[PDB]
Amino acid sequence: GIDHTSKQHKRSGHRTAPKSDNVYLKLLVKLYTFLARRTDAPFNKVVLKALFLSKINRPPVSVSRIARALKQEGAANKTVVVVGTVTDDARIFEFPKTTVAALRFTAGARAKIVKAGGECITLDQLAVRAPKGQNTLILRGPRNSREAVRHFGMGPHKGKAPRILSTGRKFERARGRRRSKGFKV
Amino acid sequence: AKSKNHTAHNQTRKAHRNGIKKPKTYKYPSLKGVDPKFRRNHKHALHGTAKALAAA
Amino acid sequence: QANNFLWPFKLSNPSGGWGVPRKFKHFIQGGSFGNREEFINKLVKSMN
Amino acid sequence: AHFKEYQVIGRRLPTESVPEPKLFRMRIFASNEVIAKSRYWYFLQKLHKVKKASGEIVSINQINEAHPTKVKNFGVWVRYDSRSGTHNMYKEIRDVSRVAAVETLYQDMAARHRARFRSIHILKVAEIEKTADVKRQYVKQFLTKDLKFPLPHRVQKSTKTFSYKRPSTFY
Amino acid sequence: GKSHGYRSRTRYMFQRDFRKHGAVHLSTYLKVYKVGDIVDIKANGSIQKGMPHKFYQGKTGVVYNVTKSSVGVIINKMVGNRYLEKRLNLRVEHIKHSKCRQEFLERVKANAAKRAEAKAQGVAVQLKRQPAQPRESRIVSTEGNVPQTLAPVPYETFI
RNA sequence: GAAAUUGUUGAAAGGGAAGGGCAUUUGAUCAGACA
RNA sequence: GGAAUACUGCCAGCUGGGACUGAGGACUGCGACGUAAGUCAAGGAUGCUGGCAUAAUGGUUAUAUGCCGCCCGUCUUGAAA
RNA sequence: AAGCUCGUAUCAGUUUUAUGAGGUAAAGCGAAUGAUUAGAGGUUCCGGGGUCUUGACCUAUUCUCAAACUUUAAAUAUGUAAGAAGUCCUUGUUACUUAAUUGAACGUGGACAUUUGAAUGAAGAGCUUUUAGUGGGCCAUUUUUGGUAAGCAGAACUGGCGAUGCGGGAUGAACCGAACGUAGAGUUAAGGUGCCGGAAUACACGCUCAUCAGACACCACAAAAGGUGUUAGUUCAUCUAGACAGGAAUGAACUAGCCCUGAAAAUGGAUGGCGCUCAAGCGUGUUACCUAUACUCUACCGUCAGGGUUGAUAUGAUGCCCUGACGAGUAGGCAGG
RNA sequence: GAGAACAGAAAUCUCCAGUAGAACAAAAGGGUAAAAGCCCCCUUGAUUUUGAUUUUCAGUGUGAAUACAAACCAUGAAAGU
Ligand SMILES: [Cl-]
Ligand SMILES: [Cl-]
Ligand SMILES: [Mg+2]
Ligand SMILES: [Mg+2]
Ligand SMILES: [Mg+2]
Ligand SMILES: [Mg+2]
Ligand SMILES: [Mg+2]
Ligand SMILES: [Mg+2]
Ligand SMILES: [Mg+2]
Ligand SMILES: [Mg+2]
Ligand SMILES: [Mg+2]
Ligand SMILES: [Mg+2]
Ligand SMILES: [Mg+2]
Ligand SMILES: [Mg+2]
Ligand SMILES: [Mg+2]
Ligand SMILES: [Mg+2]
Ligand SMILES: [Mg+2]
Ligand SMILES: [Mg+2]
Ligand SMILES: [Mg+2]
Ligand SMILES: [Mg+2]
Ligand SMILES: [Mg+2]
Ligand SMILES: [Mg+2]
Ligand SMILES: [Mg+2]
Ligand SMILES: [Mg+2]
Ligand SMILES: [Mg+2]
């Protein structure tokens, strides 16, 4: 007998492979598995883990977010790395001449980057140019902006959104939401 | 038929499965309940020292 | 650091037995538990 | 177990107010030194305001019998707890050493009064120097001049299950 | 039925000490409390306003607010399997400065003094407290201190 | 042309149930390698 | 006064008998013995020899012997009931 | 169950040091409150008989008490602190505050590195979403209420059973020991070693004879009171100056060991059975020996964790391989077949 | 307790002693003496607006209670309340 201090046979709780069956995604995983093992560069370890993430854990990154990150002092000539999809944003009227490496580019996002003099490359092209992530800049999109998040932690005095189908005057604005009807929250 | 009324048996063992968590401490705690007169002046004081550092 | 480096020792039961009919009394009262001072050496070498 | 006799010397812990406290000694019968030191604090706490955490053991030494091969008459005073009350008792034991007499005493108390080790205090053990100071007849009967007695009805030991003759108890 | 009022079971807790009734001495009102100070809570039975609940008797907290005749104190309370933050508004009669940390301030001061004293010549200033250590060897003299023999005493009634 | 259930023949066991688990004796029966 | 012995402890002192186990499968490591070449009990068994080559070992099955084994399912604090 | 952010940061059903809180155990009543026994000395234009007594207070003493009394006051539990979000030197902001550049709060700049501020440990720490079953419990030690009591009813802390086999208690949900992948060897636990039955009809000092002996925790019951049964012990007296009975010890009153009396139920009967008497009984001491699914070492299966390896010309990089640890399970969840 | 016509154990007056043995709407427990008790004077803060906090607690509601902010007032020589 052993007086165990922790739960036995516990899984690590982290993904070690993509859930997808995409054949081309598995090739990228194989490429960066090799690089992470034999380069001892922290960039390769981060990229390999990012390829395992699910869809909600890889929110899109717009070109306006990319342009703002290139305005950082001394970051104007770095290669922006996005492990996910890059989307177009028409709210910005000027774009720099950077190079962006991403898994996917939308049709609008690719056109805007190219017409500004830049280039769009894949992650295997990036590994050829920067095998150890030289002069790179990793950008991640917002996770808590997802609509499902605003319902989490619902309760009194919490200020979270209720799970409701129809919104209007007669839908969950009576007793419990104002002092004139019993009480407020 | 009469049943049991109350007991605390097994409750501490349940609480120690994942519980007894010391509260997480944050720098810059919330100013809820602080005197309103102090907070009105503290807001003006912070605006003044923000301009001085920016214009320095 | 030196002591924590060593893994907890895994000993067997004593080869010649415990020398008492009932272990779970104090060594002073003819049992086995408690502080037995230098007599621990005889017990450990039997279990090693 | 097999008893040994130790002298144990202890003291109170030195303080600035009272440096060099008094040294107290007593003779303890025990099977080892670990039990002997435990017994020392047990009796010391019955006589002085002191305990193990407030004192220290100065020296423990085994005491050997001066003439272990000489037959001696011992007088022993004991105090023991019965099932209801506490009593004092004087007994006489004939042996060749103090430890031998004490071992006999504990056996005698267990057999005749059902007194365990924890219920017995040894007050004093002293050798009786002269005849006619022995006051117990079961000891005095062995002090007669030219003592002789036979051992009737000898029972011999057999190492085999079956014997081929009727045994004899002659001696 | 059962009774669970606000001051239930506080018969002895909120009593004044023996021969210590009457008005509060002035030193209670002259002490200054600042945000971040560590105070301990002990209710005074003669001041019925701003009095803490019986749970917080004997608890220690940190000041977060200062008002005209009272201070705000933060207490961590264990509810279920976690701790919740409680904020109390207590008059100064029911609180006092805690010495659980005032004694710690001087150790910080002495550590800086010892560090600077040995900075020019010494290494390994050893600014860490250590537990009580086993005693070293010593020699006990018997000159004028010959050991006195003791024996167990017989049973006596002396009622 | 299955099972429950039944007849005949053959083998075995049976002192107030029968059936089962571990191990081996005895009887019957059987695959594998002869490189 | 000089020894012995008992008791307790230590030896990187020596040596006899018995039982269980042989996982791994080119080399690589740490050591030992040696002037050297090399050797070795040093990161897990090899050498020699006999009988039989089939129901002999073994499997299956029936039976016998030793010890053990209460009727499943279900409700229940609790079921062989 | 799905993971996510990170990679020892920080945390702990623990101790220590420093500093708080409490009114229970105990204790106390010539200390308060309330109960309560007995005298003694005093007091009346202020109780009543009688010309001196009983009551009533006063003072000093005395015996005994309290869950809803108390001056005092533990043990065990319990709050906080032991640094970088820290300490120190200088001086910026404001509509708050001060007689006042006084203070408060928040900042700029400089100085002090991990013996950086006790111990020990840390199959890593932090965080989020979602959903199953359950919401009749019961038992043991200790504390504890009602009741004569109950295998009764009701609480407190912890450990168990339920949900759990295995060795021991003959037998048993809860006791003792110990928790379970498949095997081999060795050693033990609790409990045992006359035979059933694996293991000393071992050793040692005593005690006990029952015409109803006794024999091992939980546990399967026995009391008050007695015995010149036997054993040991305590106190007093007699006795060398001859006691007791009719030439050496004796008498009286007591204490507690075993045994005996006290001891009466219904089918035949149970220290488990046989049986056992300087025990195979009781008390105690020393050794040897027996055996659990526990411990130690080895092999094999699986699970989890940390790692190595894409270079063609040979097939699975979900591949192959190296290293360490782990394996009980009802309701229920998930995974591979 | 010691005194004063009617006046007595209890009417009114005076002095002394008096840690609260009184009083504070009510049950009980706390608390209180130049007061929280008794008497006298002045008053309506038992008012307006809307938040935070404590207790029961799911950290929901209801009841009750605590500390401030912004107004307008009461009282007092004033600090204050
Ligand atoms: Cl329960
Ligand atoms: Cl059989
Ligand atoms: Mg219920
Ligand atoms: Mg052996
Ligand atoms: Mg044993
Ligand atoms: Mg009020
Ligand atoms: Mg047909
Ligand atoms: Mg058929
Ligand atoms: Mg065969
Ligand atoms: Mg069989
Ligand atoms: Mg059989
Ligand atoms: Mg059976
Ligand atoms: Mg039922
Ligand atoms: Mg059943
Ligand atoms: Mg109480
Ligand atoms: Mg008491
Ligand atoms: Mg139900
Ligand atoms: Mg019931
Ligand atoms: Mg059930
Ligand atoms: Mg039994
Ligand atoms: Mg046998
Ligand atoms: Mg015996
Ligand atoms: Mg085993
Ligand atoms: Mg296991
Ligand atoms: Mg399992």
Structural contact between residues B15 and E80, judged by C-beta atoms closer than 8 angstroms = yes
Taking the centre of ligand 17 as the mean of its atom positions, its distance from the CA of residue E80, in whole angstroms, is 25
b/e string for D98-135 if b means 16 or more Cβ within 10 A? Answer: bbbbbbbbbeebeeeeebeeebbbbbebeebeeeeebe
Structural contact between residues A35 and A109, judged by C-beta atoms closer than 8 angstroms = no
The architecture of the domain spanning D69-145 is Roll (3.10)
3 state SS of C47? helix
Neighbours of chain E (3+ CB pairs under 8 A): B, D
Q: What is the CATH number of domain D2-68?
A: 3.10.20.10
- Side chain identity, residue C24: F
D contact test, residue of E136, E148, E155, E158 with most D CBs within 10 A:
E155
The rounded distance, in Å, linking the Cα atoms of B21 and B8 is: 20
In a domain, A166, yes or no: no
Q: For A110, phi and psi rounded to 5 degrees?
A: -65, -40
Question: Of all protein residues, which has its CA closest to the C1' atom of H231?
Answer: D112
Neighbours of chain B (3+ CB pairs under 8 A): E
The experimental technique used to determine this model is cryo-EM
Kind plus residue range of the DSSP H or E element containing C45: helix C40-47
Domain count, chain A: 1
Angle at C21 between CA C15 and CA C23, to 5 degrees: 75
Å from E92 (CA) to H71 (C1')? 29
Q: For A158, phi and psi rounded to 5 degrees?
A: -90, -25
Q: At A32, list the tokens.
A: 């960066």
The rounded distance, in Å, linking the Cα atoms of A87 and A110 is: 9
Residue listed under structure tokens 């060593």? C6
D121: CB partners within 8 A, 6+ apart: D43, D78, D79, D80, E152
What is the sign of the dihedral through the CA atoms of A143, A144, A146 and A148? positive
Helices marked H in chain E — which ranges?
A: 27-30, 99-117
- Whether residue D124 and residue E142 make contact (CB cut-off 8 A), yes or no, is no
In a domain, A175, yes or no: no
Q: At E119, list the tokens.
A: 């900075």
Structural contact between residues C30 and C20, judged by C-beta atoms closer than 8 angstroms = yes
3 state SS of B48? helix
Angle at C40 between CA C38 and CA C44, to 5 degrees: 140
E75: CB partners within 8 A, 6+ apart: E41, E56, E59, E61, E85, E86, E87, E88
In a domain, A169, yes or no: no
Q: Which of chain D's residues have a Cβ under 8 Å away from the Cβ of C36?
A: 34
Q: Tell me whether D44 touches chain E (CB under 8 Å).
A: yes
DSSP state of E65: E
End-to-end CA distance of chain B: 82
What's the gap between Cα D114 and its chain centre?
A: 17
- Whether residue E147 and residue D44 make contact (CB cut-off 8 A), yes or no, is no
Q: At E108, list the tokens.
A: 């910080």
Closest CA to E147 of D24, D28, D19: D24
Å from B43 (CA) to H179 (C1')? 65
Task: Report the chain E residue with the minimal C-alpha distance to residue B23.
Answer: E83
The rounded distance, in Å, linking the Cα atoms of D7 and D13 is: 19
- Side chain identity, residue E114: K
Going by their DSSP bridges, the two strands E60-66 and E70-79 should be labelled as antiparallel
Min CA distance, C28 vs chain D (Å)?
A: 6
Min CA distance, D111 vs chain C (Å)?
A: 20
In a domain, A136, yes or no: yes
Per DSSP (E only), the strands in chain A are 61-62, 79-87, 99-105, 119-121, 136-138
What are B's interface residues with E at a Cβ cutoff of 8 A? 14-23, 29, 32-35
Distances (CA, A) of E46 to E20, E43, E50: 11, 9, 11
The rounded distance, in Å, linking the Cα atoms of A127 and A81 is: 11
Q: Which nucleotides of H are covered by protein (CB under 7 A)?
A: 2-7, 11-13, 16-24, 70-72, 78-83, 85-87, 92-97, 104-108, 112, 115-124, 126-130, 136-139, 153-160, 176-180, 186-192, 202-207, 231-234, 255-258, 278, 282-289, 294-297, 302-306, 308-311, 317-318, 326-328
The domain segmentation of chain D, as residue ranges, is: 2-68, 69-145
Mark whether E and D touch (3+ CB pairs within 8 Å).
yes
Q: Tell me whether E80 touches chain B (CB under 8 Å).
A: yes
Give the residue numbers spanning the domain of A139. 14-145
Q: At C27, list the tokens.
A: 């060594």
D12: CB partners within 8 A, 6+ apart: D18, D21, D22, D50, D54, D55
Distances (CA, A) of C2 to C5, C6, E133: 5, 7, 20
The rounded distance, in Å, linking the Cα atoms of A169 and A83 is: 43
Closest CA to A135 of A65, A76, A84: A76
Count of beta carbons in the 10 Å neighbourhood of residue D61: 11
Q: Closest nucleotide (CA of D64 to C1')?
A: G7
Q: Which nucleotides of G are covered by protein (CB under 7 A)?
A: 8-10
The rounded distance, in Å, linking the Cα atoms of D141 and D137 is: 6
Residue listed under structure tokens 């749970």? E55
3 state SS of D110? helix
b/e string for E71-92 if b means 16 or more Cβ within 10 A? Answer: bbbbbeeeeeeebeebebebbb
DSSP D38-92: HHHHHHHTTTSS--GGGEEEEEEEEEPPSSTTS-EEEEEEEEEE-SSSEEEEEEE
Min CA distance, B20 vs chain E (Å)?
A: 5
Min CA distance, D32 vs chain E (Å)?
A: 20
Closest CA to D10 of D30, D37, D34: D37
Q: At D39, list the tokens.
A: 């017994």
Distances (CA, A) of A66 to A7, A42, A141, D91: 44, 22, 10, 104
In a domain, A3, yes or no: no
A25: domain CATH number is 3.100.10.10
